[PDB]
CSV table of C-alpha atoms and ligand atoms in Angstrom, one decimal:
chain,number,residue,atom,x,y,z
X,1,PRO,CA,-50.8,-15.7,-27.2
X,2,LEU,CA,-53.7,-16.6,-24.7
X,3,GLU,CA,-56.7,-19.0,-24.2
X,4,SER,CA,-59.4,-17.2,-25.9
X,5,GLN,CA,-58.4,-18.6,-29.3
X,6,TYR,CA,-60.0,-21.9,-28.2
X,7,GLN,CA,-63.2,-22.8,-26.6
X,8,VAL,CA,-62.7,-25.7,-24.2
X,9,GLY,CA,-65.3,-28.5,-24.1
X,10,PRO,CA,-65.7,-31.7,-22.1
X,11,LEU,CA,-62.9,-33.9,-21.0
X,12,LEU,CA,-62.2,-36.8,-23.4
X,13,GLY,CA,-61.6,-40.4,-22.6
X,14,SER,CA,-63.0,-42.7,-20.0
X,15,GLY,CA,-60.3,-43.1,-17.4
X,16,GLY,CA,-56.5,-42.8,-16.7
X,17,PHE,CA,-54.5,-39.9,-15.2
X,18,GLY,CA,-54.1,-37.8,-18.4
X,19,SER,CA,-56.2,-34.8,-19.4
X,20,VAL,CA,-57.5,-34.2,-22.9
X,21,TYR,CA,-60.4,-31.9,-23.7
X,22,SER,CA,-62.5,-31.5,-26.8
X,23,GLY,CA,-62.0,-28.1,-28.2
X,24,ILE,CA,-62.9,-25.8,-31.0
X,25,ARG,CA,-60.6,-23.2,-32.6
X,26,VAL,CA,-62.4,-19.9,-32.2
X,27,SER,CA,-60.8,-18.3,-35.2
X,28,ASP,CA,-62.3,-20.9,-37.7
X,29,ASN,CA,-64.4,-23.5,-35.7
X,30,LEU,CA,-61.9,-26.3,-36.5
X,31,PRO,CA,-62.5,-29.1,-33.9
X,32,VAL,CA,-59.3,-29.8,-31.9
X,33,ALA,CA,-58.0,-31.8,-28.9
X,34,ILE,CA,-56.5,-30.0,-26.1
X,35,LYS,CA,-53.9,-32.1,-24.2
X,36,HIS,CA,-52.4,-30.8,-21.0
X,37,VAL,CA,-49.1,-32.2,-19.9
X,38,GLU,CA,-47.6,-31.8,-16.4
X,39,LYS,CA,-44.0,-30.7,-16.0
X,40,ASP,CA,-43.5,-33.2,-13.0
X,41,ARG,CA,-44.2,-36.2,-15.1
X,42,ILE,CA,-42.2,-35.4,-18.2
X,43,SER,CA,-39.1,-37.5,-17.8
X,44,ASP,CA,-38.0,-36.8,-21.4
X,45,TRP,CA,-37.1,-33.3,-22.6
X,46,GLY,CA,-35.8,-32.5,-26.0
X,47,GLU,CA,-35.1,-29.2,-27.7
X,48,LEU,CA,-36.7,-27.7,-30.7
X,49,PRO,CA,-35.1,-27.0,-34.1
X,50,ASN,CA,-34.8,-23.3,-32.9
X,51,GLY,CA,-33.5,-24.9,-29.6
X,52,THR,CA,-36.0,-24.4,-26.8
X,53,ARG,CA,-36.3,-26.9,-23.9
X,54,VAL,CA,-39.7,-28.7,-24.5
X,55,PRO,CA,-41.2,-32.2,-23.8
X,56,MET,CA,-39.9,-34.9,-26.1
X,57,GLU,CA,-43.5,-35.4,-27.1
X,58,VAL,CA,-43.5,-32.0,-28.8
X,59,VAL,CA,-40.2,-32.4,-30.6
X,60,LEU,CA,-41.6,-35.7,-32.0
X,61,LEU,CA,-45.0,-34.3,-32.9
X,62,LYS,CA,-43.3,-31.4,-34.7
X,63,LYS,CA,-41.1,-33.8,-36.6
X,64,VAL,CA,-44.0,-35.9,-37.9
X,65,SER,CA,-46.5,-33.1,-38.6
X,66,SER,CA,-47.1,-32.3,-42.3
X,67,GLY,CA,-49.4,-33.2,-45.3
X,68,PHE,CA,-49.8,-36.9,-44.5
X,69,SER,CA,-52.9,-37.6,-42.5
X,70,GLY,CA,-51.8,-40.9,-40.8
X,71,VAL,CA,-50.6,-39.2,-37.7
X,72,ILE,CA,-52.6,-36.7,-35.7
X,73,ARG,CA,-51.1,-33.2,-36.3
X,74,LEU,CA,-49.9,-30.9,-33.6
X,75,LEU,CA,-51.5,-27.5,-34.5
X,76,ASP,CA,-50.0,-25.4,-31.8
X,77,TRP,CA,-48.7,-25.7,-28.3
X,78,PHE,CA,-48.3,-23.2,-25.3
X,79,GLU,CA,-46.3,-23.5,-22.1
X,80,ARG,CA,-47.6,-22.7,-18.6
X,81,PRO,CA,-45.9,-22.4,-15.3
X,82,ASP,CA,-46.6,-26.1,-14.5
X,83,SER,CA,-47.6,-27.8,-17.7
X,84,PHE,CA,-47.5,-27.6,-21.5
X,85,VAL,CA,-50.7,-27.4,-23.5
X,86,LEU,CA,-50.9,-29.1,-26.9
X,87,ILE,CA,-53.4,-28.4,-29.6
X,88,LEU,CA,-54.0,-31.3,-32.0
X,89,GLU,CA,-56.4,-32.1,-34.7
X,90,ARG,CA,-59.6,-33.9,-33.8
X,91,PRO,CA,-61.7,-35.9,-36.3
X,92,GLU,CA,-65.4,-35.8,-35.7
X,93,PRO,CA,-67.0,-38.3,-35.4
X,94,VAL,CA,-64.1,-40.3,-34.1
X,95,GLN,CA,-63.6,-43.4,-31.9
X,96,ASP,CA,-60.4,-45.1,-30.7
X,97,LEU,CA,-59.6,-48.6,-31.9
X,98,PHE,CA,-59.9,-50.0,-28.4
X,99,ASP,CA,-63.6,-48.9,-28.0
X,100,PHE,CA,-64.3,-50.0,-31.5
X,101,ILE,CA,-63.0,-53.5,-30.7
X,102,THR,CA,-64.9,-53.4,-27.4
X,103,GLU,CA,-68.0,-52.8,-29.3
X,104,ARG,CA,-67.6,-54.9,-32.3
X,105,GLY,CA,-65.4,-57.8,-31.1
X,106,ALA,CA,-62.8,-59.5,-33.4
X,107,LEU,CA,-62.8,-57.8,-36.8
X,108,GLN,CA,-63.3,-59.4,-40.1
X,109,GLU,CA,-60.0,-59.9,-41.9
X,110,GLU,CA,-60.9,-57.5,-44.6
X,111,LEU,CA,-61.3,-54.6,-42.1
X,112,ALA,CA,-58.3,-55.7,-40.0
X,113,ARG,CA,-56.2,-55.8,-43.3
X,114,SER,CA,-57.2,-52.2,-44.1
X,115,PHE,CA,-56.8,-50.9,-40.6
X,116,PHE,CA,-53.5,-52.7,-40.2
X,117,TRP,CA,-52.1,-51.4,-43.5
X,118,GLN,CA,-52.9,-47.8,-42.5
X,119,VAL,CA,-51.1,-48.4,-39.2
X,120,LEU,CA,-48.1,-49.6,-41.2
X,121,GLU,CA,-48.2,-46.5,-43.4
X,122,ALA,CA,-48.3,-44.2,-40.3
X,123,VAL,CA,-45.5,-46.0,-38.5
X,124,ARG,CA,-43.4,-46.0,-41.7
X,125,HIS,CA,-44.0,-42.2,-41.8
X,126,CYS,CA,-42.8,-41.8,-38.3
X,127,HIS,CA,-39.7,-43.9,-38.9
X,128,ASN,CA,-39.0,-42.1,-42.1
X,129,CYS,CA,-39.2,-38.8,-40.1
X,130,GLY,CA,-36.6,-40.0,-37.4
X,131,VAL,CA,-39.4,-40.8,-34.8
X,132,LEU,CA,-40.0,-44.0,-32.9
X,133,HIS,CA,-43.5,-44.3,-31.3
X,134,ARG,CA,-42.8,-47.1,-28.8
X,135,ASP,CA,-46.5,-47.5,-27.7
X,136,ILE,CA,-48.3,-48.7,-30.8
X,137,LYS,CA,-51.6,-50.2,-29.5
X,138,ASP,CA,-55.4,-49.9,-30.1
X,139,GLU,CA,-55.8,-47.1,-27.6
X,140,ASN,CA,-53.3,-45.0,-29.5
X,141,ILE,CA,-55.1,-45.2,-32.8
X,142,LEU,CA,-58.1,-43.1,-33.7
X,143,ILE,CA,-60.7,-44.0,-36.3
X,144,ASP,CA,-62.1,-41.1,-38.4
X,145,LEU,CA,-65.4,-42.9,-38.7
X,146,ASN,CA,-66.5,-40.9,-41.8
X,147,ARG,CA,-63.5,-41.2,-44.0
X,148,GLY,CA,-62.3,-44.6,-42.6
X,149,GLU,CA,-58.8,-43.2,-41.9
X,150,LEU,CA,-56.8,-44.2,-38.9
X,151,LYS,CA,-54.6,-41.8,-37.0
X,152,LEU,CA,-51.8,-42.6,-34.6
X,153,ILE,CA,-51.7,-40.6,-31.4
X,154,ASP,CA,-49.8,-40.0,-28.2
X,155,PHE,CA,-46.1,-39.7,-28.6
X,156,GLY,CA,-45.6,-39.4,-24.9
X,157,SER,CA,-43.3,-42.5,-24.7
X,158,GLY,CA,-41.6,-42.1,-28.0
X,159,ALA,CA,-38.0,-41.3,-28.9
X,160,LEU,CA,-35.9,-40.1,-31.7
X,161,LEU,CA,-35.2,-43.2,-33.9
X,162,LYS,CA,-31.6,-44.4,-33.8
X,163,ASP,CA,-29.8,-47.6,-34.8
X,164,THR,CA,-28.2,-48.5,-31.5
X,165,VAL,CA,-29.7,-50.2,-28.5
X,166,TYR,CA,-32.5,-48.7,-26.3
X,167,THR,CA,-32.2,-49.5,-22.6
X,168,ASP,CA,-35.2,-47.5,-21.4
X,169,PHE,CA,-38.9,-48.0,-22.0
X,170,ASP,CA,-42.1,-46.5,-20.9
X,171,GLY,CA,-44.8,-47.7,-23.0
X,172,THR,CA,-47.3,-50.6,-22.5
X,173,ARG,CA,-45.7,-53.7,-21.0
X,174,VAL,CA,-48.0,-56.3,-22.7
X,175,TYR,CA,-47.0,-54.9,-26.1
X,176,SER,CA,-43.3,-54.8,-25.3
X,177,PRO,CA,-41.0,-57.5,-26.8
X,178,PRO,CA,-39.4,-60.5,-25.0
X,179,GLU,CA,-35.8,-58.9,-25.3
X,180,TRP,CA,-37.1,-56.0,-23.2
X,181,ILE,CA,-38.8,-58.2,-20.7
X,182,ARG,CA,-35.6,-60.3,-20.2
X,183,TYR,CA,-32.7,-58.0,-20.8
X,184,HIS,CA,-34.0,-54.5,-20.5
X,185,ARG,CA,-32.8,-53.9,-24.1
X,186,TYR,CA,-34.3,-53.8,-27.7
X,187,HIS,CA,-33.8,-52.1,-31.0
X,188,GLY,CA,-36.5,-49.7,-32.4
X,189,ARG,CA,-37.7,-51.3,-35.5
X,190,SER,CA,-37.8,-54.8,-34.3
X,191,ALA,CA,-39.5,-53.8,-31.1
X,192,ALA,CA,-42.1,-51.9,-33.1
X,193,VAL,CA,-42.8,-54.9,-35.3
X,194,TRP,CA,-43.5,-57.1,-32.2
X,195,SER,CA,-46.0,-54.4,-31.0
X,196,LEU,CA,-47.5,-54.6,-34.5
X,197,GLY,CA,-47.9,-58.4,-34.2
X,198,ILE,CA,-49.7,-57.9,-30.8
X,199,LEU,CA,-51.9,-55.3,-32.5
X,200,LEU,CA,-52.8,-57.4,-35.4
X,201,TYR,CA,-53.7,-60.3,-33.1
X,202,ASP,CA,-55.8,-57.9,-31.0
X,203,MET,CA,-57.7,-56.8,-34.1
X,204,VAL,CA,-58.5,-60.3,-35.4
X,205,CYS,CA,-59.1,-62.0,-32.1
X,206,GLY,CA,-60.6,-59.1,-30.2
X,207,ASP,CA,-58.0,-59.2,-27.4
X,208,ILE,CA,-54.2,-59.2,-27.0
X,209,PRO,CA,-52.5,-62.5,-26.9
X,210,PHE,CA,-50.3,-62.2,-23.7
X,211,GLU,CA,-51.0,-60.6,-20.3
X,212,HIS,CA,-48.1,-62.0,-18.3
X,213,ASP,CA,-44.3,-61.8,-18.6
X,214,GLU,CA,-43.9,-65.6,-19.1
X,215,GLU,CA,-46.4,-65.8,-22.0
X,216,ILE,CA,-44.5,-62.9,-23.7
X,217,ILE,CA,-41.2,-64.7,-23.2
X,218,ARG,CA,-42.7,-68.0,-24.2
X,219,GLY,CA,-44.1,-66.3,-27.4
X,220,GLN,CA,-46.6,-69.0,-28.2
X,221,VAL,CA,-49.7,-67.9,-29.9
X,222,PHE,CA,-53.2,-69.4,-29.5
X,223,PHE,CA,-56.0,-68.3,-31.7
X,224,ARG,CA,-59.3,-68.2,-30.0
X,225,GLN,CA,-61.2,-67.1,-33.1
X,226,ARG,CA,-61.2,-68.5,-36.7
X,227,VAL,CA,-58.3,-66.7,-38.5
X,228,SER,CA,-56.9,-67.6,-41.9
X,229,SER,CA,-53.6,-69.3,-42.1
X,230,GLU,CA,-51.9,-66.5,-43.9
X,231,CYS,CA,-53.0,-64.0,-41.2
X,232,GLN,CA,-51.8,-66.4,-38.4
X,233,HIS,CA,-48.4,-66.7,-40.2
X,234,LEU,CA,-48.0,-62.9,-40.4
X,235,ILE,CA,-48.8,-62.7,-36.8
X,236,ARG,CA,-46.3,-65.4,-35.7
X,237,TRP,CA,-43.8,-63.8,-38.0
X,238,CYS,CA,-44.1,-60.4,-36.2
X,239,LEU,CA,-43.8,-62.2,-32.9
X,240,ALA,CA,-40.6,-64.2,-33.6
X,241,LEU,CA,-38.8,-64.5,-30.3
X,242,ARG,CA,-35.5,-63.4,-32.0
X,243,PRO,CA,-35.6,-59.7,-33.1
X,244,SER,CA,-33.7,-60.5,-36.4
X,245,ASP,CA,-36.3,-63.2,-37.3
X,246,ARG,CA,-39.2,-60.4,-37.4
X,247,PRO,CA,-40.0,-59.0,-40.8
X,248,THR,CA,-39.3,-55.4,-41.8
X,249,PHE,CA,-42.1,-53.0,-42.7
X,250,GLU,CA,-41.5,-53.9,-46.3
X,251,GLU,CA,-41.9,-57.7,-45.8
X,252,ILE,CA,-44.9,-57.1,-43.7
X,253,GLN,CA,-46.5,-55.1,-46.5
X,254,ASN,CA,-45.5,-57.6,-49.3
X,255,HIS,CA,-46.9,-60.5,-47.2
X,256,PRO,CA,-49.7,-62.5,-49.1
X,257,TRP,CA,-52.2,-61.6,-46.3
X,258,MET,CA,-51.6,-57.8,-47.0
X,259,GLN,CA,-52.6,-57.9,-50.8
X,260,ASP,CA,-55.7,-56.1,-52.1
X,261,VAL,CA,-56.3,-53.8,-49.2
X,262,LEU,CA,-59.4,-51.6,-49.3
X,263,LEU,CA,-59.1,-47.8,-49.7
X,264,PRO,CA,-60.1,-45.9,-46.6
X,265,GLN,CA,-63.2,-44.6,-48.3
X,266,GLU,CA,-64.4,-48.1,-49.3
X,267,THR,CA,-63.5,-49.3,-45.8
X,268,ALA,CA,-65.8,-46.8,-44.2
X,269,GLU,CA,-68.7,-47.5,-46.7
X,270,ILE,CA,-68.4,-51.3,-46.3
X,271,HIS,CA,-67.6,-51.5,-42.6
X,272,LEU,CA,-68.3,-48.3,-41.0
X,273,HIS,CA,-71.4,-47.5,-43.1
X,274,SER,CA,-70.8,-44.1,-44.7
X,275,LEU,CA,-72.4,-43.7,-48.2
I,301,LYG,O1,-52.0,-37.5,-27.7
I,301,LYG,C1,-53.1,-37.8,-27.4
I,301,LYG,N1,-53.4,-38.5,-26.3
I,301,LYG,C2,-54.7,-38.8,-25.9
I,301,LYG,C3,-54.8,-39.5,-24.6
I,301,LYG,N2,-54.7,-40.9,-24.5
I,301,LYG,C4,-54.1,-41.4,-23.2
I,301,LYG,C5,-54.9,-42.7,-23.3
I,301,LYG,C6,-54.6,-43.1,-24.7
I,301,LYG,O2,-53.3,-43.6,-24.6
I,301,LYG,C7,-54.4,-41.9,-25.6
I,301,LYG,N3,-55.8,-38.5,-26.6
I,301,LYG,C8,-55.6,-37.8,-27.8
I,301,LYG,C9,-54.3,-37.5,-28.1
I,301,LYG,S1,-54.3,-36.6,-29.6
I,301,LYG,C10,-56.0,-36.7,-29.8
I,301,LYG,C11,-56.6,-36.1,-30.9
I,301,LYG,C12,-58.0,-36.3,-30.8
I,301,LYG,C13,-58.6,-37.0,-29.8
I,301,LYG,CL1,-60.3,-37.2,-29.8
I,301,LYG,C14,-57.9,-37.5,-28.7
I,301,LYG,C15,-56.5,-37.4,-28.7
């Protein structure tokens, strides 16, 4: 047990009410993120395979951890009287997709296609593991600036994936679909695909398409930057008003705009400058 197996560093992130510290695993120097979660604001508890009462976030992290590098891995966790503490992998150097977009504006299609594809692979891997993220967005995506690999983070609004209707939601409103806004219901996959359309527009236009409830419900997309027709068609497809008109993961990945994606390595050399 105990907190001498990590050395705590500076607080990460530039705002918000959460607490995440840069850390280093004393045992082997592995860089890690130390995320503190308060009991008071966990609304969702689950119970572990061996049946302990933990935050849903932990149950979901444990279900998606494993060889595949597309989701940040939970390396360990500890409970305290008033909070849980989660130890996760930390790439170094790293930058979130929100900052990266703040710095570099709208991304070339080629870089968006490669980022977007790795996001699809990560989300497929969560779904495949029985986990629904429910807050896919540029702040919840890390870029490993050296290998050009993206990593999905923050399962704090997620749920077990199921085929029936969800009537609760706690993620980011401007990424949530029109069926949630109007009826307080949605289904997992189709909701996630809407958030993927918002994300792809964000990447190619440098900002999200909708801020207000009405624009979400209206679902009309205006492009403010030059964006190929195939990419605009994928986006409008993801943002179909009717859930059953959205594409599956498989159709998104077999879309003509998704062909000939760069490997992560090439993506970092070309767009992140590696060598
Ligand atoms: O689960 C997380 N949450 C957050 C916090 N935030 C709340 C604001 C944003 O949604 C995400 N950061 C991280 C994680 S894992 C992780 C791993 C490496 C690094 Cl460098 C940061 C993080």
